[PDB]
Amino acid sequence: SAYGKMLEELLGPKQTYESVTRTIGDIVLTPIRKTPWGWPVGFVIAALGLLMYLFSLAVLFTVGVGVWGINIPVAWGFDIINFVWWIGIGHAGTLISAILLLFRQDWRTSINRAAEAMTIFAVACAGIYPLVHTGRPWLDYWMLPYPGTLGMWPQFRSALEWDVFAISTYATVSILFWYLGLIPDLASLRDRATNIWVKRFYGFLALGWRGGARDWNRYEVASLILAGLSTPLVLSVHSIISLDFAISQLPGWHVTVFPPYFVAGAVYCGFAMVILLLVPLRRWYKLHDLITIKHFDLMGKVMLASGLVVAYGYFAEIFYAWYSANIYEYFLITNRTMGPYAWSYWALIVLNVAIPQLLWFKRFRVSLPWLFFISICINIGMWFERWVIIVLSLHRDFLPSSWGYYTPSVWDISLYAGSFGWFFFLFFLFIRLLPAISIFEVRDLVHKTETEKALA
Amino acid sequence: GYKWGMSIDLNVCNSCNACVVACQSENNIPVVGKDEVWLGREMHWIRIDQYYVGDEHTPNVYNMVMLCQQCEHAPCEIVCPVAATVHDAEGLNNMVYNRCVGTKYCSNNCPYKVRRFNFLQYQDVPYRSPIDASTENDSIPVLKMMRNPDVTVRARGVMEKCTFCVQRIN
Amino acid sequence: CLDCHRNPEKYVRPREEVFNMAWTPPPNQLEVGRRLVQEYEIRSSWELTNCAICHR
Amino acid sequence: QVFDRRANTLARVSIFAGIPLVLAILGGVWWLFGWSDWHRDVGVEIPQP
Amino acid sequence: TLYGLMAEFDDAEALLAAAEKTRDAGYKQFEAYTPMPIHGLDEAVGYRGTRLPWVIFGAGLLGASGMFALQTWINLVEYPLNIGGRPLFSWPAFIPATFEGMVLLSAFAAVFGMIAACGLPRPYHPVFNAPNFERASVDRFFLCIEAADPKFELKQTRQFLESLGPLAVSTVDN
Amino acid sequence: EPAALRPALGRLQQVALIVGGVAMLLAVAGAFLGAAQFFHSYIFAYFFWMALSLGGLLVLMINHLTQGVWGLMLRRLLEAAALTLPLMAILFLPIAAETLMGTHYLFPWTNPEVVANDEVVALKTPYLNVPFFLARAVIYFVLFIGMAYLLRQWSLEEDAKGFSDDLRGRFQRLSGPGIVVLVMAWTFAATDWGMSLEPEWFSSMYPVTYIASMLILTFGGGIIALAVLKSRNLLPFGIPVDRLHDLGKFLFAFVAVWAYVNFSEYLIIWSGNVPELTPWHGHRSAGGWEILGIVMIFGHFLLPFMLLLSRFAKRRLANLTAIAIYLYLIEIVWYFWKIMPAFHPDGFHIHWLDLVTLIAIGGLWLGVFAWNLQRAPLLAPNDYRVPLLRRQEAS
Ligand code: HEC
Ligand code: SF4
Ligand code: SF4
Numbered sequence A: 001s002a003y004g005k006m007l008e009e010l011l012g013p014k015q016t017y018e019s020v021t022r023t024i025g026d027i028v029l030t031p032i033r034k035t036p037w038g039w040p041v042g043f044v045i046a047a048l049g050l051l052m053y054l055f056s057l058a059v060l061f062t063v064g065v066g067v068w069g070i071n072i073p074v075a076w077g078f079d080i081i082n083f084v085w086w087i088g089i090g091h092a093g094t095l096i097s098a099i100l101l102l103f104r105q106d107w108r109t110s111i112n113r114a115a116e117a118m119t120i121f122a123v124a125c126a127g128i129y130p131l132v133h134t135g136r137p138w139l140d141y142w143m144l145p146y147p148g149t150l151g152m153w154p155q156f157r158s159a160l161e162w163d164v165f166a167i168s169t170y171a172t173v174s175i176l177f178w179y180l181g182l183i184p185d186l187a188s189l190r191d192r193a194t195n196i197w198v199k200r201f202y203g204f205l206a207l208g209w210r211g212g213a214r215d216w217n218r219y220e221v222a223s224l225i226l227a228g229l230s231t232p233l234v235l236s237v238h239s240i241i242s243l244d245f246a247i248s249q250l251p252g253w254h255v256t257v258f259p260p261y262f263v264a265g266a267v268y269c270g271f272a273m274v275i276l277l278l279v280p281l282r283r284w285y286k287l288h289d290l291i292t293i294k295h296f297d298l299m300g301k302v303m304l305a306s307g308l309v310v311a312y313g314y315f316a317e318i319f320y321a322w323y324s325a326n327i328y329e330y331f332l333i334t335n336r337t338m339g340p341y342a343w344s345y346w347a348l349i350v351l352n353v354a355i356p357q358l359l360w361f362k363r364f365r366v367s368l369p370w371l372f373f374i375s376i377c378i379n380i381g382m383w384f385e386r387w388v389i390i391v392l393s394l395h396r397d398f399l400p401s402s403w404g405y406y407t408p409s410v411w412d413i414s415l416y417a418g419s420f421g422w423f424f425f426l427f428f429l430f431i432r433l434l435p436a437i438s439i440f441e442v443r444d445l446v447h448k449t450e451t452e453k454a455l456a
Numbered sequence B: 001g002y003k004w005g006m007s008i009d010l011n012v013c014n015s016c017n018a019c020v021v022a023c024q025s026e027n028n029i030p031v032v033g034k035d036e037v038w039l040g041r042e043m044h045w046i047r048i049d050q051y052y053v054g055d056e057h058t059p060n061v062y063n064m065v066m067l068c069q070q071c072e073h074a075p076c077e078i079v080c081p082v083a084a085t086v087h088d089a090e091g092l093n094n095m096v097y098n099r100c101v102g103t104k105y106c107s108n109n110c111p112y113k114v115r116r117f118n119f120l121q122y123q124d125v126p127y128r129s130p131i132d133a134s135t136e137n138d139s140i141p142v143l144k145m146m147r148n149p150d151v152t153v154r155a156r157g158v159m160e161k162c163t164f165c166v167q168r169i170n
Numbered sequence C: 001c002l003d004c005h006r007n008p009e010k011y012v013r014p015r016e017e018v019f020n021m022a023w024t025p026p027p028n029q030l031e032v033g034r035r036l037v038q039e040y041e042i043r044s045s046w047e048l049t050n051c052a053i054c055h056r
Numbered sequence D: 001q002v003f004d005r006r007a008n009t010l011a012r013v014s015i016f017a018g019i020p021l022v023l024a025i026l027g028g029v030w031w032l033f034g035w036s037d038w039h040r041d042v043g044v045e046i047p048q049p
Numbered sequence E: 001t002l003y004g005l006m007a008e009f010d011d012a013e014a015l016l017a018a019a020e021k022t023r024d025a026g027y028k029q030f031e032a033y034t035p036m037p038i039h040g041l042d043e044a045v046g047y048r049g050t051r052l053p054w055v056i057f058g059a060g061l062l063g064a065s066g067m068f069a070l071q072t073w074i075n076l077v078e079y080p081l082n083i084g085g086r087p088l089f090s091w092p093a094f095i096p097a098t099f100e101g102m103v104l105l106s107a108f109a110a111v112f113g114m115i116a117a118c119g120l121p122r123p124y125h126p127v128f129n130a131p132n133f134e135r136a137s138v139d140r141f142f143l144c145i146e147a148a149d150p151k152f153e154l155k156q157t158r159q160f161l162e163s164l165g166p167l168a169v170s171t172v173d174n
Numbered sequence F: 001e002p003a004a005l006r007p008a009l010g011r012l013q014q015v016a017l018i019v020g021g022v023a024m025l026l027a028v029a030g031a032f033l034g035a036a037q038f039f040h041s042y043i044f045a046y047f048f049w050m051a052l053s054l055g056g057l058l059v060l061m062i063n064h065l066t067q068g069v070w071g072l073m074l075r076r077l078l079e080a081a082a083l084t085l086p087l088m089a090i091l092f093l094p095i096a097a098e099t100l101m102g103t104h105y106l107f108p109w110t111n112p113e114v115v116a117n118d119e120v121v122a123l124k125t126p127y128l129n130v131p132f133f134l135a136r137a138v139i140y141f142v143l144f145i146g147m148a149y150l151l152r153q154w155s156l157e158e159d160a161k162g163f164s165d166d167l168r169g170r171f172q173r174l175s176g177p178g179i180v181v182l183v184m185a186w187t188f189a190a191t192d193w194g195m196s197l198e199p200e201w202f203s204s205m206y207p208v209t210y211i212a213s214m215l216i217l218t219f220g221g222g223i224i225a226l227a228v229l230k231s232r233n234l235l236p237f238g239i240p241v242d243r244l245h246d247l248g249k250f251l252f253a254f255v256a257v258w259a260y261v262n263f264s265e266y267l268i269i270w271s272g273n274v275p276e277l278t279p280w281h282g283h284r285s286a287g288g289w290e291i292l293g294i295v296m297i298f299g300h301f302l303l304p305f306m307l308l309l310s311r312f313a314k315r316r317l318a319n320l321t322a323i324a325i326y327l328y329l330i331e332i333v334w335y336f337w338k339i340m341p342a343f344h345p346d347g348f349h350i351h352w353l354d355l356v357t358l359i360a361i362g363g364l365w366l367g368v369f370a371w372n373l374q375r376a377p378l379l380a381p382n383d384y385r386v387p388l389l390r391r392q393e394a395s
């Protein structure tokens, strides 16, 4: 069958419902003092990143927001380049979780929990940055519409107030669509426990689920609606993290194709992180029969299909910067190609629209040592896109007497390099305590391969 | 009622910088040390801009006295999440310091970049280096007398702006 | 003080009873307080709440 | 069996009697520390010299 | 104190054909209890869908019209501000904040409205005390009926479950 | 296969050339009363059937990249829409003739005294000039027709030889980089023909708002064409009720994309009101064009946002075409809001030449669309998804 030969590319060898539940219920329920190595040495490397995170924040609150190196021309720096980068990472974690669930696609099934959880920890690492880039961070509750004894409310015309409304909707429905997905899954880890103090842990995280058609029908009509509510959300969230440049009148910022080209770069940099995280989750956790290489052949095609929309984005915003007869957008082209930060835009054309244009060929998509180098050049490269958008439009602007430079200090590096600690502190807590693959959905994928072989 | 505007005759400005230092003495503007001027964090509500038009050996040098232009359709105001930058009905731009949470987005949308952020605790900076919090909320007692009692002596993370000397307007 | 700047007519008294401490607001405070606002040229709620009034 | 029958009383009132009381604690702390006339001491007769 | 007469099944190809056979047998109070969602079980049970998507829409119209009317009451009635020269009823710049309140209250009625429509915050269901319900969420499928229907005794039912293809018909308690 | 397919598609072909030819005989004879009013009303009618033809090419390339049972029902209808692009290359000649005539009706950068006064237009004369405007125009058409003819000669190969990855490899080898050089050949064509009518006004996202409406028109045309072919009992397959909910998912998720790229085009221009970006929405929100703006929020988005939310009126055929025909009559108003207020910018007016040229290019388009439906057997019977369409019909 033409449909059966699609579903057999996702699993591979002989697999039943128990052999699928066993190989995901052995990543979890393998007890401590029996837990395999790699996870101890990574959870204490992430602790040194978290103690670089919590020290750079304890510095930041005490001495101030001006240990970063942000100038007065360029007053948004690594606090915002890494914030749009981290928000950009978790967005393709919900293209995998929500947008592909609209398309009834079955190759999103095993990539689900390693993208639902990867969204959340790229938002908990992100969402600290709108709370700590403010100079007075103890008043970020003033960006909330609450009644007080002041008659003051937030503005609701600024696109940083909508960043409050986008992320505090994005952070809460990421942890409500990943926890709803874990309601029928932690009921399976509960029944495979045979240890009552880890059975009560997964017997209370899963609320008491039982299966049941009156609960399974209510689950998926609350899942695809949630997958239909998280799909205009993430096309809006990283559009709302895109409006807080495009609302501003700056020459490199006030372009109107920022809302679809940022979210294209979010499902470009984000698929690069799912590829950068799942290639070391097959070689280290033996998931060669669930994360089979057709999942990377399709994650590479969607990363390619998203990397052309930002290849379109770099050429449109360099066309309409010339097509506008402004001297300020004529200068924008001659400040990304020339000028002091021309190396950033040429390490952007190389790392985004030259090196991952090998994604057309299957030779650099099925080969994981080539898909890893391509995706590692997107995380470095899409950081440089958000550097070119933010810094190169800020550090040289309308008036020549306000031209700055923004060379970052150590506390801009230590907060960003410390932010990967808080990602992998929680990711390695997710791998150990929770399943990395949604067991009940891949049980349906095993059931879907059997029900199409029985149609012969 | 009381539409406030300003006319700066650029033909007669000799770049004497007496208006930079009189905004400093009137509006309690903090001095910033040499290490944080090189990072472009000088606190100066008004600035004079040389521009050097012509041949690189005999040029014409032109001054633009660039202060907060108090824009009617002010782009610095629409990008303030907590509305810490609004207008009067008198027409001038009100930068209220106690509401500023410190999101430097107003400075980015200000096209003239006449917004000036307190980055560290800029207070008595040539007498204590501003990279400590051992004396952040402790101030020199004799320097408190030079401050104008009608202008907010600003905190660590709020933004400044030329307020048309609104304490002299009011 | 914002409800009293946006609606001064429910609190404004005559200038001859300002320093009289025994002055209680009348049952007809409105149409008298509104009469005193247009008499004393008291500015509107737009011009009175824009943080150059306060907050210099 | 895990989570015996007495836990149904616990799981019912934790979302039906707990969360209206926790939000009544957090509604009263919001009143007392952000809205009350106690934290800005009215009627308190501040002692003079 | 008798809740069970629940039959273990091998695969769900033989469960939905038996669950729709229970619909032909007059039992109206019965469940499926599967490790995975099967296409055509609620059609076989007779659940006729749920009213849950209208709870999601009823709270989405309360978040869209509740956040758009929030920023309008702020900017027009509560504290109108000349901020940037922009109009008081800015009908743009209220839409990217009333959309994210539409997504928020819909999903707050999609997770907490699903675990309110299903009685999931409820440990000790009377079905968990089964001899092989540890396999119920892993491999096996458990057609189970209850004592809420007027046509259930221990006989008239156990012989009917053996007229199906079961693995182990076991009576579980409360 | 029904016997009444090729006569009724022959009848609809013949009656559309007479409807779309008399209305063009009414257009050029109506062009002689008011000369400029024709070209103001012609290029409005050109964009509605250029985008309905290019979206028929653009959804066809998405149909080749993905394995959908949807789209197999559209593949002979998208190919019947993609090869009306040879008609949109010969009906482009009245737009090409005005650039050669010294009238400056259509494009005001053809005027030498607009270039000589507006310096902003004079700096776009490297790009906006008639020996290079027409040379770019035939570059788009040889890329539009050539990516429609190659997607026809390889698809008529499929019902000739048979399905393999020798042939399905060629579809994805073309339609992979096809959409790249279809978007990029449209964001040079919508700044040529559509944005350059307002030559002082540049924009990003202005071709993208058309791209999200090329998906509305050709999924709306996906459901309208499978309605008349169902109502007259001419479809070779009964429509699966699950895959019409797919076409209604696409119609709904591209109304919402369209109202996200048109509103964020407005949200950016309204927020920072730069006077080189606001003249478009300032001419389109004043003098009667304010009425079509409020229509585009409510009648185009919010009325097909609510009725396209339930499964009812998305799973039923008779209540989805009540949205898809209504989305055509609200996109016709939208292309009248995109194109026409570039001419007579202060004030709203609509001529009878506006809605007799839409019939003129329309019946010409619907005749060539119906000419290419007799070429194909409407099923693509040697496809790989047609065993899945053999399923979902017997429940
Ligand atoms: C006079 C009627 C005022 C107007 C026009 C504004 N404010 Fe405003 N403010 C006023 C008073 C008497 C206080 C002290 C209240 C108290 O003791 O709690 C305040 C205080 C504030 C704050 C609180 C600062 C803090 O708690 O650290 C803020 C944020 C504030 N005021 C903001 C603000 C804004 C944005 C205004 C815009 C028009 C504004 N204020 C006007 C009195 C007045
Ligand atoms: S404007 Fe300033 S620099 Fe110019 S003359 Fe006056 S005080 Fe001197
Ligand atoms: S600070 Fe700049 S943007 Fe703000 S009102 Fe003054 S001139 Fe305008």
Ligand code: F3S
Binding pocket: B079, B080, B081, B082, B083, B084, B085, B099, B100, B101, B102, B103, B104, B105, B106, B107, B158, B159
């Ligand atoms: S936008 Fe708003 S809160 Fe502070 S620094 Fe800028 S004012």
